[PDB]
Symmetry: D2
Subunit: 375 residues, 4 copies
């Protein structure tokens, strides 16, 4: 049936995403020294200040203030004219610290479930709305940092409404792009530049018609942004972090958490499964639901929803997942080789659909395709 579907993303300068990146920068700095550390780092940013809090158990010694200032500086807040300055904002630490047979048989601590999702409607096997929303704010940051549009400032949001028909994309119905900018540029010039340097190189021409609506800084000037007059907190962008609303989400933020937190690592594993099923050609689109029982390691149930797109029977998919992936809480950590400082890169522009992340590798695809008996 014909319908619209919308997703959004936000730049690395958005205050919630600032907090995510600081949490994962702290996490990465600890993991570099202590790969087995327990970290639950929650950040709060607002006018003039960063508060980094939470709980860690580690042998690592890290300078929270330096990590914080370096992270905000890299994002681009370096002057009070932008609303925020990495060099002169307040940084407060409130982190409680503590000192540090078959480990893979560790059972789950909760009744829980995890969702994964993939679809061959894009090259990265992600839903088109979240993919192109991500790409729009990532492009905003790129042309900001490389000097193409030097008047851009870090804070930006995007939103894309796709039209579907019979489950395939027909085009883009509406685009929102709001970006922070310096005082000197006028809105008409800004809108033309955003169209030419951000929107047009990112969105396929075939999907843009004369009916497409473009809302580029629709309320006009956007000089002050980031944390200034606007709070950011770790874990308040969990839908832009994942699938943009296209898939179900069981709850649980990612950033600031070490891989032992099932909320993060099991979600990564569930994406890994779904992406490899679709890359194998076993379905065009796939939502996986992994259920865990308190005190047992293997998932208690694995449901593979294929939305009628399956190329083999649905029971065969469940069995293939049982055979080729280790979805035990600690086994998936080993499968994905997660005990490394790789998380700051995940904390803006999406945890899924990205290049080099281990849960985005399609290295079980051909094995699954063979095992299911097709070519």
């Amino acid at each position: 049936a014909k319908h619209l579907f919308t997703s959004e993303s936000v730049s690395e300068g958005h205050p919630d995403k600032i907090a995510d990146q600081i949490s994962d920068a702290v996490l990465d700095a600890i993991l570099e020294q202590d790969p087995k550390a327990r970290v639950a780092c929650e950040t709060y940013v607002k006018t003039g200040m960063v508060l980094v809090g939470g709980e860690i158990t580690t042998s690592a010694w890290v300078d929270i203030e330096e990590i914080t200032r370096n992270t905000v500086r890299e994002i681009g807040y370096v002057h009070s004219d932008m609303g925020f300055d990495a060099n002169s904002c307040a940084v407060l630490s409130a982190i409680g610290k503590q000192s540090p047979a078959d480990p893979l048989e560790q059972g789950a601590g909760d009744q829980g479930l995890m969702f994964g999702y993939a679809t061959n409607e894009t090259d990265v096997l992600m839903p088109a709305p979240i993919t192109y929303a991500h790409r729009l704010v990532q492009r905003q940051a790129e042309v900001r940092k490389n000097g193409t549009l030097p008047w851009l400032r870090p804070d930006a949001k995007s939103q894309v409404t796709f039209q579907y028909d019979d489950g395939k994309i027909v085009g883009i119905d509406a685009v929102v792009l709001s970006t922070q900018h310096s005082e000197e540029i006028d809105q008409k010039s800004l809108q033309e530049a955003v169209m030419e340097e951000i929107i047009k190189p990112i969105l396929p021409a075939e999907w843009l018609t004369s009916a497409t609506k473009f809302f580029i800084n629709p309320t006009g000037r956007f000089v002050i942004g980031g944390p200034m007059g606007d709070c950011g907190l770790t874990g308040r962008k969990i839908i832009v972090d994942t699938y943009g609303g296209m898939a179900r989400h069981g709850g649980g933020a990612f950033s600031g958490k070490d891989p032992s937190k099932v909320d993060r690592s099991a979600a990564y594993a569930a994406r890994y499964v779904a992406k490899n099923i679709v890359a194998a050609g076993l379905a065009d689109r796939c939502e996986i639901q992994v259920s865990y029982a308190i005190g047992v390691a293997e998932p208690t149930s694995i449901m593979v929803e294929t939305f009628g797109t399956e190329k083999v029977p649905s029971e065969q998919l469940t069995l293939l997942v049982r055979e080729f992936f280790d979805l035990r809480p600690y086994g998936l950590i080993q499968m994905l080789d997660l005990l490394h400082p790789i998380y700051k890169e995940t904390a803006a522009y999406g945890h899924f659909g990205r290049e080099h992340f281990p849960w985005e590798k399609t290295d079980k695809a051909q094995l699954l395709r063979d095992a299911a008996g097709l070519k």
Copy 2:
């Protein structure tokens, strides 16, 4: 096979933050129903930080509201981990003082996407797992406060796992209930009281079988809780707040936001739309997506999904939605009569399924059914 949802009591640190954010909201709306409020709370060992931005004529004492909220939750002694009377309360709220000929045509305050959902698998038209998860922790607080089990303490968590078959409920596979308690209670007595006074009054006997597992405090003594050794933030329970994983989410938090914020009010309106479609008998379950562009009053998209359970063509449903509901941002407010101090009640035990909330009324169901030509 299996589906699990969880809930947390008013004493969970994330929910403490939601309740403080909405108590501030309600205190302001009592004096100034048109106030703009964006209140974000951070709680952890010994402290509450209440931050954000308000535009109002109201005069409120944030510290008093905060201590009162924590006192009502029940944290009143350091032995519990947290004490309303002696914790630190910091305020970082920026205050400003207070556009269309027809206020119904006011543009949205932000972009974003919002989902609503309804299913006839329970009488309140909610998914069963989140419904009974909520009622368990709600019942823990009720018997804690009314004197029945006075040795209970505020922090608690529930998990209910349902078994499905042919898409219908077959029974409850597992129930977890963890509750905080005073040092004098032994676990055996605790488990028996919880089972007698909390679980059995709440879960339907028809869904309890020989295969149903019960886990009461599976990790033993639970004496300190809440913010102690932990950290709670507003808007980190958005799946608990809504449908428990059964339906999708647009990502926006609810608590601390006045009804001009479409993250909250349009999610309420999408629940109202979906619930009225299911109550009309036009679908067995229905999910609504809406989205907005900042400065634009008409939604950038409306999508209705009925999972093949629709009783009239999907195209007719979308038309009925556009005919009978005003989803413009200020249309939402007037449709649901939202400018009242009603929001602290929503900040624990779920925003949906409690049928005295305005977005829970099924007062358009008969109109829809009549317009659809159904008898």
Copy 3:
């Protein structure tokens, strides 16, 4: 012998905190003159924390008062190290309902007991015409002159943070001259040190220090560490009540330990030091001593001071036994008697929080309206 006193401008981080604390006090007293206020401020890079306890009916916006105060001091850009418009302001003030004890707990409010124990000193000397020690007097005037030329457009490139030191040479108890002068001032990036030193010399130092006391031997040090572009709370920390000697007599006289700023007049740490200055100054203006130091002390809950002591360093012109009598006769040093004697229940305290609480003769504790009564009572003509 030599004697040095120092002062700091309104832009020094400790004084920023004193000023915010008294700006909050004044805004409250504007609405509720009987309010109880104990406001303590902490400033450091990027943030202000305003804490304490108030009992008042007033409704004030702590964050707005704080940003306005910082903006007036002049911190408005990250280039300076601190920006009123974008720093963080955290409020941690606990509020209580009344605004004293409703109807006071004494039939005669003059008989109310002290709110705390403690000791307080006051001092006066006829070394200067405002009856203050010279070194702190000229130290204050230097940094006050810095802020004046910065704000009135004379030297717009100055920035808020600044510090002065003045060393006087004494001989036989008399001023012979100024031995050394130190003046460090924050400035914008484009001014070079040589233009800065000459500008400070011509516009700040020479207009303020008496030419008679400056000689070929007087040493002048303008920005002895050179470049001074970032300052204030940046890379530093300011706290209410950490400048209690610059607030009073610059080391020339003793101190009882209590801070002034952020305290309403029911706090004897503040009001009894003001009253002791008023006593000592009226004794010296009366010609009863060339210099005079007063100590008072209180017990919490007790209205009569636990001790009054009058020290005149051998300069008294009548027997000291008579002086102590005159003090008991002409001044009401009970806690609330202090308030009524000096008319303290008014929003006048933010002006005291930089450039010194004493020597500025429009303040009520600087009036010498008892001097002639004292002289007449002592039998002097």
Copy 4:
């Protein structure tokens, strides 16, 4: 006639702050004796904020130091108003990496006072000395189980009467102490008199005239940071001489010894104490003047209040000969680069005769070098 000084116990909120500031200093100095430290603490209902600036190679856990300090002081329960185990601890310390030194000139036109008098055995003014001993005794009988219902927060004040520089008696004593709910005021007053006041104050100074104000406003159950702020550097007269000597300004706690405000003040005490211990005077205020860029003090005034046993100008020359008062020389003279400062942050920096600036090891040298 009368002179009054006060002191406060280790549980008073300002002294809690001083103690946390110097506990952080001590932990840094144990790993890095040359560290630069300027640690400012703010304490209030439910929270400790530890702020400031350090340059050091040391790695310390600010939260653990803070909780350990508050626990030892005795705040361990919300009933007392404050709990080491569950209060908030926030850190905001800026950290820099490490980057003839005895000829270092002063950085400021400075003045430093030191004082001593033989009116007590520790060569301190009597009002501050006995004020300290009262609150220190309060803490001792709280901690050793003698009066276990005492709680940490207490203040003392003592008014002495003088005749011609000599003590004649004590006129007034204030002792206010926090306590548990269950004890009545009458029993508290009797217990405080018998166990705190009478063992500390010499009986020959107490008469029928002496006024005793013991918890004069009654119940004192809530205390410490609860409902009233504590900040580092807000007890600088308690820390020094109780108001008897002049003070040029500048707090001690949280500052490493390279801060002249602290170490030059210690050096001035050391000089004054030895002069009196040598018998060159009975009481003695020393005023040390520094010029910027100059190491040796540019002026040393030795005020003796007419009690000198030797020509007053000899005293200055004896000080020059026997003491190294250059800014970094005095640090060597007093051997200051050691973690000794948390103990100084309650009950006074002067008067306790194990600290280095309280040794009278130059008294015999000064006495021999003079006529005596």
